[PDB]
């Protein structure tokens, strides 16, 4: 377990870095997840 690693791969910045990650966040926002990212 590592916080640096976790925030590097699944974090908000990494998600928004690409259109695929933006789509992940959009999917999770449509579903209503409390946690959209790490």
């Amino acid at each position: 377990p590592s916080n640096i690693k976790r925030k590097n791969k699944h974090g908000w910045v990494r998600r928004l870095s690409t259109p695929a990650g933006v789509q992940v966040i959009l999917r999770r926002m449509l579903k209503g997840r409390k946690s959209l990212s790490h």
Binding site: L16, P19, V22, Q23, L26, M29, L30
Partner: protein, 113 residues
């Protein structure tokens, strides 16, 4: 606590004082400048395609050489509009459910009384 009501009374008094001073400040601002809000802002459209009220921050350098600011995306690419439509439909569903439930409740009320 000996008398907890006076805490609420003090809090209400201070909220009233803040309201009064704020009213004076905004009246003066409307008079001198015509602006309605103290903090400058804009209507922008973030990466997820939603309209937001972006509140501005104070900076030393202008925006075109602000490295961090220019990383933010105030526009949506065409892959968002499908998700915008699906969110619209989700909101529509919630509203339809609510309005129908209100009508059913009214029917029940009229049935009983």
């Amino acid at each position: 606590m000996p008398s907890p009501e006076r805490l609420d009374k003090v809090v209400d008094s201070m909220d009233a004082l803040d309201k009064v001073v704020q009213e004076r400040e905004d009246a003066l601002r409307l008079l001198q400048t015509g602006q309605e809000r103290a903090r400058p802002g804009a209507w922008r459209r973030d990466i997820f395609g939603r309209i937001i009220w972006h509140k501005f921050k104070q900076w030393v350098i202008p925006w075109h050489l602000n490295k961090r600011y220019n990383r933010k995306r105030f526009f949506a690419l065409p892959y968002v509009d499908h998700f915008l439509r699906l969110e619209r439909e989700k909101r529509a569903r919630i509203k339809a459910r609510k309005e129908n439930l209100e009508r059913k409740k009214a029917k029940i009320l009229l049935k009983k009384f």
